[PDB]
Amino acid sequence: LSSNTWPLHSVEFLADFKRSSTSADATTYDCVPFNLPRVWSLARCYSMWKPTRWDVVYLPEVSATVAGSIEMCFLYDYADTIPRYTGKMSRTAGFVTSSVWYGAEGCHLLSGGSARNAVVASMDCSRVGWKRVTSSIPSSVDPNVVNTILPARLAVRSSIKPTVSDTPGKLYVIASMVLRDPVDPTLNT
Amino acid sequence: EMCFLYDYADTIPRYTGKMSRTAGFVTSSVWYGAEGCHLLSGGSARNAVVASMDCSRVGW
Amino acid sequence: LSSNTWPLHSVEFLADFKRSSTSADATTYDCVPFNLPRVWSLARCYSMWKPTRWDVVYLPEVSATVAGSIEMCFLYDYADTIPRYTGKMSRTAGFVTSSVWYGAEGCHLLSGGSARNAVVASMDCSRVGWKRVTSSIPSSVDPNVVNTILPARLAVRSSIKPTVSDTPGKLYVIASMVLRDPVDPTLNT
Amino acid sequence: AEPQLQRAPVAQASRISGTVPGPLSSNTWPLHSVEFLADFKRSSTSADATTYDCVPFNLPRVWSLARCYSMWKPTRWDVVYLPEVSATVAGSIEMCFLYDYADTIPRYTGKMSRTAGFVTSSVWYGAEGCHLLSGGSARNAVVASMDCSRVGWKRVTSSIPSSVDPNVVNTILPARLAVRSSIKPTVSDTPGKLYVIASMVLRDPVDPTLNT
Amino acid sequence: AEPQLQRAPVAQASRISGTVPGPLSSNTWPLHSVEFLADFKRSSTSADATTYDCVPFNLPRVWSLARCYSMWKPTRWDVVYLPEVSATVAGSIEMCFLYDYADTIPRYTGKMSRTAGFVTSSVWYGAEGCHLLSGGSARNAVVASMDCSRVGWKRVTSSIPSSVDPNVVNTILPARLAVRSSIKPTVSDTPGKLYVIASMVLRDPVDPTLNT
Amino acid sequence: AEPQLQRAPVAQASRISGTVPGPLSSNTWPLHSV
Ligand SMILES: [Ca+2]
Ligand SMILES: [Ca+2]
Ligand SMILES: [Ca+2]
Ligand SMILES: [Ca+2]
Numbered sequence A, C: 001l002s003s004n005t006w007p008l009h010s011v012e013f014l015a016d017f018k019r020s021s022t023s024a025d026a027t028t029y030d031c032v033p034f035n036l037p038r039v040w041s042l043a044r045c046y047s048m049w050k051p052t053r054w055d056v057v058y059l060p061e062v063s064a065t066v067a068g069s070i071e072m073c074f075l076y077d078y079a080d081t082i083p084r085y086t087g088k089m090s091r092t093a094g095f096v097t098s099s100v101w102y103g104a105e106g107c108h109l110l111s112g113g114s115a116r117n118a119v120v121a122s123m124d125c126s127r128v129g130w131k132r133v134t135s136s137i138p139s140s141v142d143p144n145v146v147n148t149i150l151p152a153r154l155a156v157r158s159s160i161k162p163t164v165s166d167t168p169g170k171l172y173v174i175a176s177m178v179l180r181d182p183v184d185p186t187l188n189t
Numbered sequence B: 001e002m003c004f005l006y007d008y009a010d011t012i013p014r015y016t017g018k019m020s021r022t023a024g025f026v027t028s029s030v031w032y033g034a035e036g037c038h039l040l041s042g043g044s045a046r047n048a049v050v051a052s053m054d055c056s057r058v059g060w
Numbered sequence D, E: 001a002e003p004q005l006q007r008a009p010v011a012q013a014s015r016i017s018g019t020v021p022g023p024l025s026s027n028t029w030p031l032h033s034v035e036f037l038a039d040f041k042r043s044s045t046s047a048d049a050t051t052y053d054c055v056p057f058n059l060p061r062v063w064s065l066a067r068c069y070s071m072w073k074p075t076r077w078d079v080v081y082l083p084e085v086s087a088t089v090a091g092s093i094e095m096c097f098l099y100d101y102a103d104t105i106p107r108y109t110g111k112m113s114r115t116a117g118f119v120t121s122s123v124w125y126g127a128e129g130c131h132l133l134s135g136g137s138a139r140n141a142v143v144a145s146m147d148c149s150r151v152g153w154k155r156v157t158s159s160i161p162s163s164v165d166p167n168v169v170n171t172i173l174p175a176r177l178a179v180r181s182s183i184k185p186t187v188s189d190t191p192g193k194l195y196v197i198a199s200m201v202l203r204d205p206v207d208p209t210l211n212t
Numbered sequence F: 001a002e003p004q005l006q007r008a009p010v011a012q013a014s015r016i017s018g019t020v021p022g023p024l025s026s027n028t029w030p031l032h033s034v
Helices: A037-043 A086-091 A104-110 A143-147 B016-020 B034-038 C037-043 C086-090 C104-109 D060-066 D109-113 D127-131 D166-170 E060-066 E109-113 E127-131 E166-170
Strands: A006-019 A027-030 A048-051 A055-060 A069-075 A096-099 A120-122 A153-158 A166-179 C006-019 C027-030 C048-051 C055-060 C069-075 C096-099 C120-122 C153-158 C166-179 D028-042 D050-053 D069-074 D078-083 D092-098 D119-122 D142-145 D176-181 D189-205 E028-042 E050-053 E069-074 E078-083 E092-098 E119-122 E142-145 E176-181 E189-205
Touching (some): A006 A153, A006 B016, A006 C006, A037 A166, A037 C037, A055 A104, A069 A086, A069 A120, A086 A096, A086 A153, C006 C037, C006 C153, C055 C069, C069 C120, C086 C096, C086 C153, D028 D060, D028 D176, D060 D069, D060 D189, D078 D092, D092 D109, D092 D142, D109 D119, E028 E050, E028 E060, E028 E176, E060 E069, E078 E092, E078 E127, E092 E142, E109 E119, E119 E142
Antiparallel strands (some): A006 A166, A048 A166, A055 A166, C006 C166, C048 C166, C055 C120, C055 C166, C069 C153, D028 D189, D050 D176, D078 D142, D078 D189, D092 D176, E028 E189, E050 E176, E069 E189, E078 E142, E092 E119, E092 E176
């Protein structure tokens, strides 16, 4: 309800699903407001935030004959190593893989929501507490310090290496959060 | 990519990020959504690519 | 509650109450999100807004010996002439006046409630419809065009011409609104 | 019957939803176990208590399972002392828990007694604690229980950042068990054993090889 | 449940059968309406009757709907005269229908009377015709009915080829209403109003912008 | 009713199992004659 607490449901483009022709490493995305321009514009006006939903849906835009799959999972510890292959991915939390060309049915999740044959990677938000809204990540520090601000990292991996670097789809985030103690957007770091 | 602009003064999105941040946003494989043909007659928007405009609160 | 809609309660510094040593005219403030940095940072992420509250509190910060008083009222039509004197101010909506050094007791209004000894000028928000959020105002246009985006103007006046321009207190806005259709903050005009 | 005229699709989505099935694939996994913690070492020169980090990687068997999950939350953690000395042995064992890495390790009985979870026992008392490790009956056991209520979800690590601000260590270390000897024998000895009866909940799987 | 492994087809036919659904998409559409036709203008110099082409595009509201169809067939077409003058006004209104564009417009009572659908009335008679425009009761109304039986399906046009053989005009013009004043006032005047009570059937839709 | 939106497959197997039907297609055929 109220008393220094504003609930928020947003949908925003997160990033392009990029496939490397050389690296087998997954690309990680920090599940924090400053990574979503519009949501950041809102969140930066508050000192604290608490994710309630945070779901990343993959929407493809390539031929149905393209080869490969997209793999997704969430990493809840910054200290944890970024998956360099399918098993590592298949073994971790929120795992989900689907042919790179599949997914369009997920557009219904964006507008409204009837996730059926949607390719989503849901983050474990239950038991995720009030974190401090920051404008950056102290990567140069002990992973434990980072954990303080990073609820989780989305790991996205190309099941295979295309002959040329490419992007067969896009990742959109459907976030739901509550914001708490106001701050001047310009002083929020 | 489809979305609705409710203020003529607002700038037309020039890219995916901008489009996604706009009301009524929707995207689809250009080859997805043929089932939308049945929408034009009966119904079943289950597998259709539709961009709905916020009509509630729109006055006379 | 949902689907392009969430209430927003905010408090922000509006402007310094400036007393002209030569002019008797009232200063005018446009009651729109873009005139409140933080609130603007939020409202700009939406296409439409609807004021639910909008109250401006006068909080003094001068000696109990300063003479003169502050006068406030709201103008709901851009075409309407700005009050030149006390009688005029007194005859317009939301009119309130108070000795320039009184009003400190209204600080709990900023956090909590009890406008019991406050110097507030409340805008009539009931029956104020959805207005498009704008980054500016067409000041050289027909007032009716302006009225489209301007719910009202706060008119502040000094009941006295001090020997030298001075600012006896400040005006703080206590706004409560609902925003509606998402829009990229950078594309909002 | 008639041979079926299969229609060949341009492709066919290959999809898997959720962590691949197996022993530790559930979102969460509760685990209870008895784990040998350490020997109750009695220094003959130092009066300082010995510290033990109450974290999964310090429990060999539990760690095997725990490293497959990224988050854990202690629910029980109880350390039982088992005497292996005669009733002629003088001395006492002192145990308590330290919930802030920045806090100083007690160097004497008074300090130990003023600390949470404090407990003392004749070094030759508590053999009945053997039955605790299996069935139950902590009636006559020497146990040091860690305050687990209010302990939140901690990240599972394979190490402790020791030369770092105690505050960052606290983010991973729910508590430390402090074990002290009430007296200094003429020569270092080992009056008994310390076994941990841990109970925890693991959450959010992760490839073990990535877990650090 | 299990994620469904969708089979992607080389394509997927996009098909629509029949005029897209909406207000005027039916093969045929019947429409009844009251439409103001014109003022009963009484010339003070000419004895010639005034002609009115009984075609859809001459009925503003009806035309709005009619232009969405390519074919129409009149079913009723009745023109009611409404007096707006006192019972002291001399003169009569004469009405009849001309079913051949090549036919000469009557210049006098005798000619008018010899023409189909003929009718005359004291210019101040027929106010009860007001009730016709709504409910009914043509008992005391001055009405000129057009012979609609036997009128076939006509193409809907937005114009009349006037400087063309009357025979080609006939293909589009079911009939003309001829209105005449039995007398010449000292100066042109307007004793009443002419309202049409049309009933027609529209058939075979067409984009309005193409309809001409 | 609604026109059915046929899904076109890359192909479609053309298959026949067993000797094409007719008078002498059976695995065996008994015959008696003068
Ligand atoms: Ca901050
Ligand atoms: Ca705008
Ligand atoms: Ca870890
Ligand atoms: Ca036509």
